[PDB]
Design a protein around this ligand. Structure first.
Ligand SMILES: *[C@@H]1O[C@H](CO)[C@@H](O[C@@H]2O[C@H](CO)[C@@H](O)[C@H](O)[C@H]2NC(C)=O)[C@H](O)[C@H]1NC(C)=O
Ligand SMILES: *[C@@H]1O[C@H](CO)[C@@H](O[C@@H]2O[C@H](CO)[C@@H](O)[C@H](O)[C@H]2NC(C)=O)[C@H](O)[C@H]1NC(C)=O
Lengths: 50, 49
């Protein structure tokens, strides 16, 4: 009905309506990072997604 | 003592280079530290998940 991996999590599953194999992968996420020259110099900032 | 046997020490250096080139791939256990740290990180991630 479903598969697993080394992490023992959900990565593949069989739909209960048809016979087509599906795959489960989480979408894009991560910790946001910031680059700034400091408040004493300027105010422009460069936001970064890691 | 350098220029008395310059050809001899050049041949010895080439032989040592060939010997270490053979010995780097002679056994798969000559890089134990990198394999150990990689396996330790992989096992830490595996027990974490
Ligand atoms: C569950 O019902 C759906 C209804 O769409 C079935 O899907 C159809 O099944 C017939 C019979 O094989 C096919 O000829 C159609 O092409 C299918 N349609 C689609 C959109 O897939 C499905 O087979 C049924 N499942 C079970 C286990 O009975
Ligand atoms: C000093 O040692 C080197 C290496 O052990 C000797 O070089 C070898 O000499 C023999 C016979 O002369 C050759 O068959 C080998 O091919 C040489 N080896 C290499 C890597 O070239 C050298 O002859 C020795 N010198 C003295 C004065 O004993």
């Amino acid at each position: 009905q479903f598969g697993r991996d080394i992490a023992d999590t959900t990565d593949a599953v069989r739909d209960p309506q048809t016979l087509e194999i599906l795959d489960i992968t989480p979408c894009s996420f991560g910790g946001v990072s910031v680059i700034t020259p400091g408040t004493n110099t300027s105010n422009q900032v460069a936001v970064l997604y890691q | 003592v350098l220029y008395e046997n310059q050809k001899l020490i050049a041949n010895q250096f080439n032989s040592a280079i060939g010997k270490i080139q053979d010995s780097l791939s002679s056994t798969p256990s000559a890089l134990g530290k990198l394999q150990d740290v990689v396996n330790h990180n992989a096992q830490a991630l595996n027990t974490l998940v």
